[PDB]
Symmetry: C3
């Protein structure tokens, strides 16, 4: 019965494509609001990827954040900036890769997660996060620098709001086979 | 009568400036909606140029797209990404330069056009397109890389909606001397 | 009494950090509207920084602009583009550093200011401005080019509207220790 053997090699080809510099890097930012709704920003790009957004009061204030990267990211390149400290005394970013948890399904890394809560004394947060593809060629930009400039133009961004997390998991996470970690610490994703 | 000879050289100077790395690259994306209205995004920049936008239902759904580049683009560098296929199996872009038509006026290339229709089964499209200036120095980024970084900041974007294509051609295309191809396959533009 | 001597060295450390390539570059664009209100866009980033925005009629039309950079900028790298001249004959930017005034407090440069008025015959302006950190290493991008690509993702942008300039100075400029120059030519800022 050959049907099985071919399916196995075609998954190995997919992992090798995704780990090449033609594989995407994906990031998601989930903002958890006080009315129980969830706002998600997703950006997908080649070479590197980032999000920079302002999360303010809606129709309800944001209370926590979860940032998730695809497994192609180099966790050590992850950087995050946040604010709304005087400018004279500010650092440009922090390297937060050590705070990311591995999301696993069937013992396979499907993503990396950084969850943190926001102080109650706030109703707004401005936030930016950035990560680079883990391929060993990433810091060897001779591929051409202009290819990376084009990737900045071709990055696609998606933004959606859901009424509760259960709706997010059932109609956004599960049908799209995305990695996730919900309020009850249940893992989602599809191992290759 | 000298008035004529000078006018001719000053057009040759303009073409040579536009074909130098100080010439702009321009892109337009036209989205044709079901109520007959047209939405246009224009971006102009040095070295390279791109647009990334989401075209969703209005007050009416988008039905086709036309992408137009200025003649300074290198058609072989054009890349386009599109979506809303699972992420595990996605390619970052397609090279679509071969699908672009030359727009001509008086036998002179005034622009390059890619028109495609959208499936009826959709009411949204997310789309990004990118192109690089054709000057032979484009892939020789030693000009400095920081100059190209500044160009990303200085790119100007314009967005307008028109009630019908005739209004677009009469009050946007014709008075601004832009290249275009309308529903009846008529060409617009001004030869240098 | 040692309390004084330590405070002095810690200011010298701050200036040296800000003048290193880990110091931020900051830009502000103030748009002064006909009803006396003020719109401000602020962007802060590492290596280089820019803003590109469209200032159109509100609820009232914009009448003048003030652009302010932090002292870390190289004034000679400042570039500005502006419009809404035919595209065939356009330049990509002008170098406007010579038009910037030094803002000083206690004989110390706290910022650089370019103020200009808009023609009465307009109700809109599209505008982009860009500047590079003055550290001598800025044009030596071997730090890696990918670090500069990440900085583009991590830049944070802030946008606020105020009813009159007095409210801007009292609740935005003064409490945040920002450099400024008001309608009566009074200087604001905090010397290090």
């Amino acid at each position: 019965d050959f049907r099985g053997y071919i399916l196995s090699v075609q998954a190995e080809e997919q992992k090798n494509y995704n780990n090449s510099l033609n594989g995407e890097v994906s990031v998601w930012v989930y903002a958890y609001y006080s009315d129980g709704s969830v706002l998600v920003i997703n950006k997908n790009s080649q070479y590197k990827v980032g999000i920079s957004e302002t999360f303010k009061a809606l129709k309800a204030k944001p209370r926590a954040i979860q940032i998730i990267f695809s497994p192609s990211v180099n966790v050590r390149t992850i950087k995050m900036a946040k604010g709304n400290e005087y400018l004279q005394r500010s650092h440009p970013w922090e390297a937060t890769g050590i705070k990311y948890q591995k999301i696993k399904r069937d013992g396979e890394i499907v993503g990396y997660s950084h969850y943190f809560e926001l102080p109650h004394e706030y109703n707004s947060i401005s936030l930016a996060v950035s990560g680079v593809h883990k391929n060993p060629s990433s810091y060897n930009v001779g591929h051409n620098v202009m290819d990376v400039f084009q990737s900045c133009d071709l990055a696609l961004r998606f933004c959606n709001r859901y009424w509760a997390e259960l709706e997010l998991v059932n109609h956004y996470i599960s049908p799209n086979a995305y990695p996730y970690l919900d309020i009850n610490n249940h893992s989602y994703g599809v191992a290759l």
